[PDB]
Amino acid sequence: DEIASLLQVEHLLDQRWRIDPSLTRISALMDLLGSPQRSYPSIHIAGTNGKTSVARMVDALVTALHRRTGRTTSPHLQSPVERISIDGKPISPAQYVATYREIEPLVALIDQQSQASPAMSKFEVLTAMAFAAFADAPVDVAVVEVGMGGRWDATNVINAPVAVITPISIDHVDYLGADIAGIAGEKAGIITRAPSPDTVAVIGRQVPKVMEVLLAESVRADASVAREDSEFAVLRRQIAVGGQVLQLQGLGGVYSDIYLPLHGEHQAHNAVLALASVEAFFGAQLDGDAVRAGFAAVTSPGRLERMRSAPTVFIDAAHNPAGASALAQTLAHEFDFRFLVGVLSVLGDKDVDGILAALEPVFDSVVVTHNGSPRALDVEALALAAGERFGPDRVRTAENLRDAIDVATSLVDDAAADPDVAGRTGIVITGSVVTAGAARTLFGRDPQ
Ligand SMILES: Nc1ncnc2c1ncn2[C@@H]1O[C@H](COP(=O)(O)OP(=O)(O)O)[C@@H](O)[C@H]1O
Ligand SMILES: [Co+2]
């Protein structure tokens, strides 16, 4: 019945689905709520890739330093409870429902005042729920991931003392040409002038035109800036059983023998970015044992996460060229597979061709399918896209994800039976958050 109540809430929220760049609705709602989102400090995270992983690393580090955290991330993989976490764990379905019920009369009032002056969007309501729940807990620090962009995102009502910008590239596609400067500018909108110490902008690796824009906006916000490879850096990294071992230069010095239980060079970069952000937040050197303990406790469900071995099955949320490239490089560099089959479903607003082109060098073949989202590309369209990069001989189709996994499985069994192929095989389920999340539920894992 807890689960059932949660389903009732989601059914309503899903009926909501216009933009409000002035942040009028969510600002009004926060006023009615008593401005809960101003009653704790936040670390605020924007960018194209690594936002969620960095958010979870920040949470882990702040928790290892023994402050009580709240964390809001998006999208969710399996259950919307994942979007609001306290003390490093999703809240329960009962708490999620109680949070919605407690703000609902004020949400209804904004919905009505708005339509008498558009309803509030589902993201606006989720964001208000996270902020209310953080004040209900209460937390010492909130870690807040942008839903989309930054400047006009519903989370952008917090004036965060630390703003973090992870690597920026293309993800959502409106045009063939890219306004990388306009893209950078929107995300920079979370770097705000402090009322207090000046805001700190902590910036991961960027292309030059992006960096220029971010530095300009940091100047407009009076923000201090820390940049990867100038103020902090990954110094050394070794692959290790279960992940990797790092030596990081943070803002307060060198931290050594950091074991991070996640695969991928990109996760090393997300780690040092998270470290510099937590250092900035506390004014850092941080206790090195607490930094080692926080990193060791990091999870990032659905980011190159292994569901089993013999055969190995990975799930990965990659849904843009930069992420599919990080995934392909990790599979090639940190493992020794003799045969890999991809199981793929991708949403229609992504750079599908860029995703396939990054994965073609590592997937011996691919099974394309539909992950159940209304926004997913249909199987026939994805099959043709795949065919253009893989050749039709390396492409198969399946009506749904469970079928697609069964197809991949028989391909990997055949490879295993093929003396000059794999007589060290794996299946990689990717292409979307929804694809990764649905697969995670098929493999029976609880939301994290
Ligand atoms: N720094 C990074 N660079 C490139 N790809 C990344 C990075 N961090 C994560 N990824 C890839 O992007 C996917 C989504 O990662 P996540 O940490 O959820 O980012 P976001 O919250 O920005 O969407 C991951 O599965 C992984 O493939
Ligand atoms: Co995310």
Ligand SMILES: [Co+2]
């Ligand atoms: Co669009």
Ligand SMILES: [Co+2]
């Ligand atoms: Co010690």
Ligand SMILES: [Co+2]
């Ligand atoms: Co053979």
Ligand SMILES: [Mg+2]
């Ligand atoms: Mg994305």
